[PDB]
């Protein structure tokens, strides 16, 4: 079915967000795993899979709407060198993605692409969960301190 | 069966206590859950259910004794902004409820409402358990310190 | 995540509706149970649980959006003294809640709070079911008469 | 296999009957369901499926006999506004269908289309069952009265 | 163990109440069964067993306290000739038994026979349940009318 | 609950679309089955059931909103005489239905009928799947040729 | 453990190959899926997972050897517009990756990084399998022709 061109660009832009998230989260995961922070590796790894599921949905949608998924361009990864910096970087990434999502959803509605919209709201709901998790973790670090926080990540 | 009027007022007053406890405990629970303090969310949530069971018992009793359960008036909730303050507030609530319970039990006995009395003693026994749990938690916070205490609530 | 302030007020107002519904439905339930109308006690009781689930969703959402859930203020309960009056009172309550819900949903959409919106539409769908059930019961009372209707509620 | 042309017209006419029955029964079903008359919704719904099975048999037969099933023309639905009127309308529909069936069966026999005939007799046997059920229900309404009859439909 | 003499007299008086209840309930049960009121036979029969359990408890207690259980004297049975009269008669019986129970419980407490007391409160709690059931049934008779009430007792 | 009149007309119009789809798909199915194209009979048959599920949803919704479902008027079926023509006709039908759906969804939103809207978006999502399937099949016919395509439909 | 710097660069380069393969294969997969070529979607999808497993191994290894995995730079994807072109593009990609792999393996051996070597030989063995599969598919296309080849991909 020929889709609205601007919806397709939005979908590709969103796809673009997912593919930075996929990599940044995956590297973070294995950084944590390396450091022995087993618990944070399990969670970030599973968020990486989450972003992959999202990318797949965009890809199938773009293809269905007869556009070209763009997996060629990769935005800026911001990796960071310690637990806090890296969680904080994932949070900024999620917050930017949510911003773009809110914009795309409004636009899909106004051209009547209600199923692209519905798919995007489901994704947003997931993003909002990722945001909840990062925010809580970052606060726990302050509340219990870094040393206690790290000890808490040792067993899955 | 027509009950003693003053027993009914006592039952309604006690019902009133349960309904503040229900709300205060439920909010506290989801405050803890939000903060990632998973363990305290499980316990307060289950105390919330406990207070609901109590309310139900009062309601069925009042109705049986042919009075009007009053779910309209809600006493003061005292929420508090951090773990200690909030546990401490639940403890004062429990202590006030126990006080009212002791009074009602004595009065039920003197008008021969032994089954209202028996029901109230069972509830009091539960309250006294809630009091035990709050007192222990509050002491643990001092003994192990706030940071260690918080780390201890992360996993259920 | 910091939410839109007006969405939070709406959420608290809706939460407020749920908490009157919870109490009014619960009392009605146990009034029916007392009268031996076993079937109406099962249904209203299960609607009470429904409204509790709703309240919980609002509470977690408000907390997530970083506002203060307000469980302190309780609107007017309208209890009523016989089956019809009481069903009819639940129906007016549901109709008012749906009205507020329609308003909040439109507003969430216009500030792009699509996940609050999505949650609210799911709740509205439940409310609309509660409305269907009340409307049908009230009509059955007229169609079959009050005596036959009551006999019909004796066994669950 | 090339069939007798007039058998095909009969088959299409009968198919036509089934397709009004399908719709009228389905709407009636969901009218009863809406009104809370759960028992009548189950039965009419299952008669709707029955008529669908019949239509399917006609369609496959027409196709086998190399004619064109006509699903384009739809006869008059007569819906009615209350339980009796609506049951009574289904009964007139069944009685008309049986009449057409008796005629087609006789004609199939005389051109030696014995398998069309055999299929039609099986269907007629079903119709005659639907007629039995409507007649009994209509009589029960008089014998027990409308109010008792309605109370009797509340549980499946 | 030698018990307080007056506690023993109370126990025998209460035993006396149970033995009228046993008979009156059993006859009522089989009267209902004869009349085809299957549901009321099941309930009254099970209340008969209940009163037997009570009598047994008194008998074992009296014997333990070294008194003589008196099964010789039987109070007045009041049977009645129709469903209402008979339910109403069971209710007056229960109300009289509860009165005697309240008196005995107070007295046991004041001579420190706390286990006799505890046993009596458990029994009272059962009586109060029997009272609830009779009161509800009697009200259902008025609310739904005698004919509908009787039809409602036909199947267990 | 009294619904918006124009939503009801839309619902009836959409219901109208479903009922042509139901018939056209069912006939197509049994045409394919007759021709031995077993695979296409399974799929179109299951799309027929899909459209039935849709019709049912409209019917229950209209009834709930207190309007009259219209199963009397049947739009134009366009049957076609060979596989391609017939698939292509189903595709035009789906495309027209999606158009009407997009319009109704926008309108439901603006009168705040969010649950009708939610139901319509779910249906649209299904339609969009039916469109995907038809488009793919039509392209496969060109890519692999008609003869290979037909051989491919012989086994389910 | 501090690794040899040049082994780390090789590992990152190889990682780089895997990440183009991951995307190109994933898009190809969903392109085939869209076109209904179900069989080719299953295989390319599973090759995508394969390349992901490879990337993960590089990432964990680089991290272990204390270097920085580079997921930021993405080489050229070459997508192509039809089945042959796209398979042929995957084959060129695999052939280039194998070339780099052969070079890295020889170099790891000469600095005594035998476990990086062992890991690389296992990966190479997988690549060589991917190459086998592409080569066979491309030949099947010529041997059986494009139309027969496409029909052959319709069912998984
Ligand atoms: C105020 C008077 C209330 C009464 C009398 C009441 C009564 C009850 C009862 C009897 C239960 C079942 C307990 C059991 O058998 O395990 C229950 C469950 C529950 N209640 Fe309430 N309730 C009240 C208010 C609330 C409130 C304000 C909330 C907060 C949202 C709430 C949340 C819940 C939840 C989440 C469940 C369990 C549902 C599940 O299975 O997931 N209740 N309630
Ligand atoms: C036009 C209004 C119709 C409505 C609202 C309707 C509704 C339904 C529904 C709800 C089902 C059950 C779906 C499920 O749970 O699997 C069903 C089944 C079915 N329908 Fe229809 N239907 C309609 C017309 C037709 C027509 C014209 C035919 C053609 C003969 C047909 C053929 C069938 C068949 C063969 C089944 C499966 C029954 C079985 O299990 O054997 N329907 N229908
Ligand atoms: C005088 C008229 C009475 C009648 C017609 C009667 C009838 C019955 C019947 C039919 C059973 C059930 C038998 C079975 O199926 O196993 C039963 C059980 C029993 N009866 Fe009686 N009974 C009478 C008096 C009493 C008395 C005075 C006592 C002394 C306390 C007594 C004690 C019991 C006990 C302990 C059971 C067993 C219940 C259980 O399963 O726990 N009954 N009775
Ligand atoms: C960038 C585009 C990518 C897409 C669209 C994608 C897609 C997927 C999907 C759909 C799954 C299976 C999830 C399910 O069960 O449904 C998966 C699994 C997986 N992915 Fe990705 N992926 C991508 C990139 C990556 C990257 C860069 C890595 C890093 C090495 C990676 C690592 C993994 C791993 C380790 C698994 C699971 C393997 C297992 O342990 O069973 N993926 N991917
Ligand atoms: Fe995402
Ligand atoms: Fe995310
Ligand atoms: Fe309590
Ligand atoms: Fe308590
Ligand atoms: Fe609600
Ligand atoms: Fe509600
Ligand atoms: Fe039929
Ligand atoms: Fe029929
Ligand atoms: Fe007793
Ligand atoms: Fe008793
Ligand atoms: Fe449809
Ligand atoms: Fe469709
Ligand atoms: Fe690879
Ligand atoms: Fe490879």
């Amino acid at each position: 079915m020929k889709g609205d061109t601007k919806v397709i660009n939005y979908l590709n832009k969103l796809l673009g967000n997912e593919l930075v998230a996929i990599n940044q989260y995956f590297l973070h995961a294995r950084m944590f795993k390396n450091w022995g922070l087993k618990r944070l590796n399990d969670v970030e790894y599973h968020e990486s899979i989450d972003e992959m599921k999202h990318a797949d949905r965009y890809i199938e949608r773009i293809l269905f709407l007869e556009g070209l998924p763009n997996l060629q361009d990769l935005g800026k990864l911001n990796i960071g060198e310690d637990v806090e910096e890296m969680l904080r970087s994932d949070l900024a990434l999620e917050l930017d993605g949510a911003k773009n999502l809110r914009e795309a959803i409004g636009y899909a509605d106004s051209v009547h692409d209600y199923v692209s919209r519905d798919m995007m709201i489901e994704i947003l709901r997931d993003e909002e969960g990722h945001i909840d998790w990062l925010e809580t973790e970052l606060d726990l670090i302050q509340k219990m301190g870094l040393q206690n926080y790290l000890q808490a990540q040792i067993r899955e």
Side-chain angles (χ1 to χ4, degrees), chain A:
Chain A
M1 200 177 75
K2 251 217 67 175
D4 169 272
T5 293
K6 185 156 233 262
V7 174
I8 295 162
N9 306 341
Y10 267 124
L11 262 28
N12 262 317
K13 175 171 163 124
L14 296 178
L15 171 55
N17 288 340
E18 302 302 335
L19 346 281
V20 358
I22 283 160
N23 291 180
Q24 169 167 318
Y25 266 139
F26 203 86
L27 215 204
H28 283 170
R30 309 267 114 124
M31 279 177 71
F32 297 138
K33 182 157 127 110
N34 182 264
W35 291 334
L37 281 16
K38 222 106 56 48
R39 207 262 233 157
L40 255 14
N41 164 78
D42 298 349
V43 175
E44 297 260 292
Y45 176 84
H46 292 291
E47 300 204 323
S48 204
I49 303 320
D50 265 25
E51 307 310 8
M52 289 174 218
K53 296 205 203 190
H54 293 165
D56 191 15
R57 282 171 87 190
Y58 290 124
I59 291 158
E60 296 193 352
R61 190 62 190 169
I62 294 172
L63 255 11
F64 169 59
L65 297 176
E66 299 173 39
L68 276 359
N70 176 358
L71 282 81
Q72 174 77 75
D73 310 314
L74 193 62
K76 212 213 163 153
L77 263 44
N78 166 22
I79 302 309
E81 294 153 312
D82 59 77
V83 185
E84 209 197 314
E85 193 172 325
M86 45 204 281
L87 262 28
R88 222 172 254 300
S89 179
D90 296 336
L91 176 57
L93 193 54
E94 290 280 351
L95 259 16
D96 279 331
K99 196 169 285 128
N100 303 156
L101 261 169
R102 303 200 144 92
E103 191 190 321
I105 285 162
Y107 175 82
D109 186 88
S110 53
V111 289
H112 296 92
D113 191 353
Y114 300 115
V115 359
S116 295
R117 179 164 153 130
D118 185 68
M119 167 203 276
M120 288 188 287
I121 290 157
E122 280 172 35
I123 290 161
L124 178 54
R125 183 172 172 185
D126 289 354
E127 301 308 7
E128 214 140 291
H130 299 157
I131 295 158
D132 191 2
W133 183 81
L134 273 340
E135 284 173 344
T136 306
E137 289 309 296
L138 290 178
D139 283 354
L140 288 169
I141 297 181
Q142 303 303 284
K143 300 209 195 83
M144 85 186 58
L146 180 56
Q147 299 195 313
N148 278 174
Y149 182 84
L150 266 11
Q151 175 203 7
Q153 316 301 329
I154 268 182
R155 309 152 166 269
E156 36 205 8

